[PDB]
Amino acid sequence: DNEIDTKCINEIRMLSAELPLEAKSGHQGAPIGCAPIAHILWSYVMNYYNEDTKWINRDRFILSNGHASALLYTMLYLTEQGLSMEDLKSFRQFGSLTPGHPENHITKGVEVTTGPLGQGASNAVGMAIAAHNLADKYNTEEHKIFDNYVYAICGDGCMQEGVFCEAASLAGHLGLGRLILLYDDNKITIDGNTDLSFTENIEKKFEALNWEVRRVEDGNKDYKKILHEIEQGKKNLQQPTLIIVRTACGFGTKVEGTCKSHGLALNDEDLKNAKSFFGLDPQKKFHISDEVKEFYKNVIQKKKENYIKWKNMFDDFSLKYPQVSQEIIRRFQNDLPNNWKDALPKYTPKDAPGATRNLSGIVLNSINKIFPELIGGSADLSESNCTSLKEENDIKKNSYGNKYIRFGVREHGMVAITNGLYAYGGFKPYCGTFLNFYTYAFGALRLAALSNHHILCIATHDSVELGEDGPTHQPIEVLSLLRSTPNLNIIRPADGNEVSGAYLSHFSNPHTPTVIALCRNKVPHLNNTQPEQVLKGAYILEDFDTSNNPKVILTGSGSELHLCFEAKEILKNQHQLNVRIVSFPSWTLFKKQPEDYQYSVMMHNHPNLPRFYIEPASTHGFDTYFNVYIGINQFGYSAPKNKIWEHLGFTPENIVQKVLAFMKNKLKEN
Amino acid sequence: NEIDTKCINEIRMLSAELPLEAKSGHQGAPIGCAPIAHILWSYVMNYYNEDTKWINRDRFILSNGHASALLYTMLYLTEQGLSMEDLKSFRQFGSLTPGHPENHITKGVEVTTGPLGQGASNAVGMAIAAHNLADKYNTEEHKIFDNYVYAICGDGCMQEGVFCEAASLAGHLGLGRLILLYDDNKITIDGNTDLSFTENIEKKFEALNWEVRRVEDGNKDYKKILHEIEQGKKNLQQPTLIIVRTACGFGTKVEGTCKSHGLALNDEDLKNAKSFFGLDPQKKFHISDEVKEFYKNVIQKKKENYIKWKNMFDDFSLKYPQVSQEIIRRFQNDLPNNWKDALPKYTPKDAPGATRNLSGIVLNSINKIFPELIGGSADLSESNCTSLKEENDIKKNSYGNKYIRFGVREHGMVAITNGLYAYGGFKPYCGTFLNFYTYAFGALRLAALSNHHILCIATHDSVELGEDGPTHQPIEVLSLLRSTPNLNIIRPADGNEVSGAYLSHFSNPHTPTVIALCRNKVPHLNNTQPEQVLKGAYILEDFDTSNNPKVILTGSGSELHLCFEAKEILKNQHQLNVRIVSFPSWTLFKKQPEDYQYSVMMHNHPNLPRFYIEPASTHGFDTYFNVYIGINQFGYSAPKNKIWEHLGFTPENIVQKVLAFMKNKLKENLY
Ligand SMILES: Cc1ncc(C[n+]2csc(CCOP(=O)(O)OP(=O)(O)O)c2C)c(N)n1
Ligand SMILES: Cc1ncc(C[n+]2csc(CCOP(=O)(O)OP(=O)(O)O)c2C)c(N)n1
Ligand SMILES: [Mg+2]
Ligand SMILES: [Mg+2]
């Protein structure tokens, strides 16, 4: 043993613990407990380059137990990856680079946003898929361009969440040996001892999932064993490795091993006492000794030396294989393939009707041919979701350089893995399930929006239009949910041109996740639909004529917009009205537009103008743009689509009656 | 004998005919699981066909809900309220036989399934109830509650996180009254399970502290199915998983292919299958006299067992009348006498309190008079304020308690809470931070669809929670809940409204309630009233009789007190006539007559300033309001006061927005 390692570990414990104390808010116990793991990971195990936190061959790190953020920030400070001491002292303060739970959009060296338990460890499964795939796709005998590992720390909370139960099952099924998960086995959660609620035999469970399991019995002091088990885990490339590290929460302090150690239970005096216990100066606050600084300066230098060897190898590879090097650079710069928009199909009303889910499958297969970086799949609904890619193969154990993932019945794990694939870099991932079952996964979908992860969510069977599977499958509240979530696009295309526009919208908004809502049965290709105009959220398909007849606006989207065209025929020829038709594929994209544009389309500054909307979902929000509408403020039915639409008034005849009734009443009041 | 095989095969074939008639649905699992079903209803399960709400019945759950045609066939054969004409109306509008089972529609359907993983997780809650009631009420001579929970699930349920969570809790609590039969058929929709699902299930469930049993030939070895179920029942210290290997679509042309999952057998195919199984291929929707006679005898034997129980319960009720009356009251869903006396009352003279703490006071008050109150928090008992003083945890070998430590398992917690309600006899509650109910929305939405009367305590409801930051601060959740049918979301502003929110929950017994509660202290407000919370919005201070220009300020939760501070400025510095409206619940308000809604909000007046403040998405606000402060972005890791200052949650910013709206309206009207 060299005392410098123990000195580093103990100064990391106390600096980390000081951040919540300064903020009077946050968690000290796990940062103290996990300091040995962190010292080992950053000083000996992980390969990174402090001057380029986006190095394409870095080992990615994820703190799944995100409440331990003070530990991560201490490590990013010590390894000079972009945090100053003043940043550390700004822990949990407005606008700081050190929020109470790590956010990848705020802080360099933070790969994903954690805090909601189970997400980070599931994200890491997706990064391990990426690491295996790219090694298989690009490495040669002499050039190991991608040879990196995914390291994560988690606690008991992540081990209980279903999202990580799902992701861990897939990780074992796929044999992702590049994943190393260190579990802080400290017998503590917020309510108290884990014995209150959590007594699984974790080792036996993870062996049943096809993980390799290793153990460190004294994770507070045996940092050489932590290093040894990590190094041995890396040698087993056919199984993800779980390392169960036994620690004491708040080790060495007054609150050690009690559930109060979870949070902020060490004041100034308690930290002085802990510093004395650990052999440090109790009078120096926010202090790193010269010897520890010198140690981490040397760590940084050794990391850079390893980076320079890779860089020289990459330059040699790039001379020998220029077109492959060009592809790698393009993918990791998030640049899109040359002439990619030529892959988006175009249609006219003379083409045969098609379901928008099927039209989406045509687009997916078209762009798959020119996007080497496209990756994803369905949660056991590949045919119904139309996500299958012709002539591609499944990612499977010992065959990672493929594009299609069989997620199985794991919506939440799916989306978190999809998040991890995007966050790794170099990928444009997509996922699929029925729209109604994305709420199984909203924990991870909300994080895509907060994290700016550019993921594509194919969501078919978007309404009661799906028919006999019934109310447990028919969304009512989901469109409203998505429209109420910041930085998320929900697009509900009406026909083939608009499906192409929905994919165009996704790739034109590269910091925002997209959900494309798609219908089950065929709908007609409509007059004047335009892919580029989907980007504006709403646009006019047929404007007012030049007559002096009373004016009406009909608006719709998805599988009901064609009903507005049918209603227009009746209103025009049977009731002598002047009807505008507006397509409303995306509320979120529309809200981005200047108000002058929004009023030019919806004319919602006119109180007496009939402004109609139809949508098979909750009417929450409709009063913003509309003053007469048909929605669904109830659960659905197990019945054929036509019977549901008849019962709920999704017919041209009912649109007509609603508009006429609004107008007759308006005229009488006028 | 041959009768059991004949019963099984007629069940296979009648079940397979319902989707064919509807030209929609799933034939393979109903065929594959028919032997399990025959054994469960004919030999294992104790029920009473004339009372599907018998309090000591064995509850059954079909977790692989796409197999609904099988369940309906059994409810028909055991005469539990479905006719042949109902079976022929499978998946038709208004029928009692929807494509996935719905407890609100069909007698003998205990929970609503179809979303995978839910039913098996509900069954864990049902097993908690069965263990709890046995411990609470049984005596040496009177086994009032001695029943078991039976469930069938497929591969999909075994992959879903909600059931991974619930199964972990089931093993931790040692719920030996739970028996789960797993249809291990190597098939899901995409194809072979080896595409995505290769766990060693037996070893995994042993690690979760389940007992695991197996039936290697679940297509034909029905005696072994019966044997393993009966042995599973004898181990009361562990839930039992029975891994039943079947062939999806066994005996038919699609046997063992993923095409068998859905609708892949036509009229000719079913004739061929009937010949394979020794049945008359020319008779459709047919049960033979021999099979009808067999199930008539089953029903009579179940009734004999019920009469024995009823006689014992009558003897118990004479010896312990007060206890018997409590059991009856709980299972009737009736509330204790004078229960509303448990709801505290406050005035503006009382000291400020956080609404989460005030909720904790109400919970402990009603706990004293509600023996049927049960629940807990997902590892946030202190922060959610859900702890019950002087109550004990439910734990292995100690089930007659009221508090559940759910651990870090929000989705499993809500599904278990659903199961506790669906069992009968309970008023369950659960708790987590509001932002983490979207982890559990699969189950929460089903509470609404199923009419499960569950209470969801949801604290830390906004950016007001402060430094934990944007991963913890809801923006979209209030809107989601307001957009969900048959669900109440209530955000009480102070102590009186917290009592009103509990009043609202127990006054609306077929609707789940989410109560959104804040972290820090807020003042008790003028004229708040618990009974008025039932109307969703109501006037706290109404207009005076002056001719000064009118303004309405509306708020809820932790921001309503800001409207009082803004009113003081608008009245004293600007001479305006200001109404204050409390808006604790959009969902309760929407169910009021329009005339009431307009009398409160006055949203038929375009030029009247109608203000609202809420720390969440402005989606929906234009229904009642024309000027407002919301949050259409994610939050911040920062102290609450810093966030409110930055985003304009201040009395002075309310004043500026109202005055700017008014100045502009005057200018437009002068034109
Ligand atoms: C999904 C979710 N549910 C709940 C919380 C609240 N919470 C934060 S940490 C924690 C559990 C703490 O246990 P563990 O992960 O073992 O951490 P330790 O206290 O040992 O550091 C919980 C429930 C959360 N952050 N995310
Ligand atoms: C949460 C959820 N996701 C997806 C579906 C769609 N779905 C219905 S059945 C099924 C898989 C069928 O697998 P299994 O449970 O093994 O049933 P089997 O085909 O063997 O009868 C899926 C994905 C669903 N009903 N619920
Ligand atoms: Mg812990
Ligand atoms: Mg199966």
Side-chain angles (χ1 to χ4, degrees), chain A residues 156-162 165 189 194 197-198, chain B residues 165 406-409:
Chain A
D156 307 285
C158 298
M159 304 302 297
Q160 298 179 43
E161 291 280 5
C165 295
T189 61
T194 43
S197 57
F198 180 51
Chain B
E165 292 178 20
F406 290 100
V408 197
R409 310 177 175 99

Side-chain angles (χ1 to χ4, degrees), chain A residues 25 27 92-94 99-101 103 113-117 119 157 160-162 165-166 169 173 189-191 195-201 204-205 207-209 380-382 394 406 408-411 436-437 439-440 442-443 446 449-450 468-469 471-477 480-481 483-486 587 618 620-621 623-624 634-635 637-640 647, chain B residues 24 26 91-93 98-100 102 112-116 118 156 159-161 164-165 168 172 188-190 194-200 203-204 206-208 379-381 393 405 407-410 435-436 438-439 441-442 445 448-449 467-468 470-476 479-480 482-485 586 617 619-620 622-623 633-634 636-639 646:
Chain A
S25 169
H27 314 80
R92 287 176 171 251
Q93 303 312 105
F94 190 85
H101 299 88
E103 310 179 40
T113 299
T114 58
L117 297 163
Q119 300 289 335
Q160 298 179 43
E161 291 280 5
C165 295
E166 289 175 22
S169 174
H173 171 73
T189 61
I190 297 189
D191 271 20
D195 284 349
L196 294 176
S197 57
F198 180 51
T199 51
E200 313 177 7
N201 182 339
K204 185 175 174 170
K205 181 202 211 183
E207 304 193 326
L209 299 178
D380 202 43
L381 291 164
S382 303
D394 299 339
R406 300 281 174 182
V409 197
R410 307 178 177 98
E411 297 79 16
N436 203 45
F437 301 137
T439 45
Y440 267 56
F442 200 71
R446 174 185 214 268
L450 181 53
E468 296 89 333
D469 271 351
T472 64
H473 286 57
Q474 299 158 347
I476 299 293
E477 73 283 19
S480 182
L481 167 64
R483 292 164 187 162
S484 309
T485 307
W587 284 59
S618 169
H620 196 58
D623 293 314
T624 299
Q634 57 163 93
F635 290 111
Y637 303 92
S638 174
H647 176 76
Chain B
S24 173
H26 312 80
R91 290 177 170 250
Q92 291 327 102
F93 187 88
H100 297 89
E102 292 181 56
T112 297
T113 57
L116 298 157
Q118 299 291 337
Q159 296 176 51
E160 289 281 6
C164 291
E165 292 178 20
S168 177
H172 172 72
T188 64
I189 294 191
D190 268 17
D194 62 12
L195 295 180
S196 54
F197 178 50
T198 49
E199 311 176 12
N200 182 340
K203 183 173 176 166
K204 188 200 199 181
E206 290 179 336
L208 298 179
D379 203 44
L380 291 169
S381 301
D393 297 346
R405 304 282 175 181
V408 197
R409 310 177 175 99
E410 297 81 14
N435 203 45
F436 299 137
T438 45
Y439 268 55
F441 201 73
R445 167 189 219 268
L449 178 53
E467 294 90 334
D468 276 345
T471 68
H472 284 56
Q473 300 157 344
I475 301 291
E476 75 284 9
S479 183
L480 164 66
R482 287 166 189 165
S483 308
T484 305
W586 283 59
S617 165
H619 195 58
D622 296 316
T623 300
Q633 54 164 95
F634 293 108
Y636 304 92
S637 173
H646 176 73

